[PDB]
Amino acid sequence: QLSSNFYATKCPNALSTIKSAVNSAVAKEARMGASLLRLHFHDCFVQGCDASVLLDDTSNFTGEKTAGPNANSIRGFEVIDTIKSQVESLCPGVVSCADILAVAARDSVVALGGASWNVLLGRRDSTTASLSSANSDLPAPFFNLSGLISAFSNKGFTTKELVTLSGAHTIGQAQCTAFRTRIYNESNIDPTYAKSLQANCPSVGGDTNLSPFDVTTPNKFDNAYYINLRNKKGLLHSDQQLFNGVSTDSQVTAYSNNAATFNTDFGNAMIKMGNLSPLTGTSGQIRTNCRKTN
Ligand code: HEM
Ligand SMILES: *[C@@H]1O[C@H](CO)[C@@H](O)[C@H](O)[C@H]1NC(C)=O
Ligand SMILES: [Ca+2]
Numbered sequence: 001q002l003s004s005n006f007y008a009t010k011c012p013n014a015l016s017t018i019k020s021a022v023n024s025a026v027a028k029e030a031r032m033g034a035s036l037l038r039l040h041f042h043d044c045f046v047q048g049c050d051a052s053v054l055l056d057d058t059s060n061f062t063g064e065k066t067a068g069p070n071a072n073s074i075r076g077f078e079v080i081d082t083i084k085s086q087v088e089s090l091c092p093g094v095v096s097c098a099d100i101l102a103v104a105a106r107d108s109v110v111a112l113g114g115a116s117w118n119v120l121l122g123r124r125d126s127t128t129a130s131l132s133s134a135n136s137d138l139p140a141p142f143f144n145l146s147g148l149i150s151a152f153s154n155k156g157f158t159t160k161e162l163v164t165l166s167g168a169h170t171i172g173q174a175q176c177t178a179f180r181t182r183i184y185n186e187s188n189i190d191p192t193y194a195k196s197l198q199a200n201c202p203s204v205g206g207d208t209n210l211s212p213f214d215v216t217t218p219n220k221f222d223n224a225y226y227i228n229l230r231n232k233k234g235l236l237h238s239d240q241q242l243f244n245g246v247s248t249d250s251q252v253t254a255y256s257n258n259a260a261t262f263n264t265d266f267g268n269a270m271i272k273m274g275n276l277s278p279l280t281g282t283s284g285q286i287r288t289n290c291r292k293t294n
């Protein structure tokens, strides 16, 4: 029931407003564009794209923020707050947090050089959150190719699309604690690549130490992610699992040689993710504050 022109009459300038907030936020911090995109992913994979990941914990409620894959990982909440506030003065109670999260993800990719896609709008916000689902549904970086396939299959994604979506790691950064085991106890990685990574990612401590996902173009949305994979320069265990004599090898090679096919396929995959269990019609609500239920 989602449409790109959903806010055409209700709030004509909503999209422009969102693009502007994102553009400056990602200009001050390139990484922000990656945080926001990921934020949308963490929203959609846990009980639909309903902004459930934005609800703060309270005296009688526990959201998704403390979930294993969320705690100390996901960021961007502040940026979303100001985007919401601006749109609220523009047209009170029209634009939902769920849609904002979907647009921000898109504008961020574009700000970082990626190809834009038509975002479908019309999602409503939830009154609930699932800590448990956040823990189980979201993939872990130590998963093997089969496990990743299962994880995406549960949401209706195919192996190819999994490869397509992992491309999102063409921008952003990961904490040392997320790849430490790889650069030390793994062999399928360029020795020199590992060596340097061992420097700013001690086997003992320094968990917080961040390192780029795409060493070639850390903050530019392109197909370089796949090029790294071929040259065994993947950051996470889950990253190299796509190019290691397995089924996904061909797709990785296809993407590394043709950037356009990646750009196109990614947009389509994002639109698909944006359609994960949405609340529409009159169900849910248009939160005035993305951190709390009305
Ligand atoms: C294929 C399985 C995937 C796994 C196992 C996974 C896991 C991770 C982990 C461990 C981090 C870093 C967390 C931290 O250290 O704080 C991360 C970052 C990131 N991921 Fe994924 N991810 C996957 C899929 C995706 C998808 C499909 C998207 C969404 C389109 C995405 C977008 C990003 C972005 C852009 C970052 C960087 C965030 C930032 O710099 O703030 N990831 N991912
Ligand atoms: C991943 O694969 C390795 C080698 O088959 C295996 O030892 C390990 O237990 C697997 N872990 C997961 C989470 O699948
Ligand atoms: Ca959700």
Ligand SMILES: [Ca+2]
Pocket (backbone or CB within 6 Å): 170, 171, 214, 216, 217, 218, 219, 220, 221, 222, 223, 224, 225
């Ligand atoms: Ca890149």
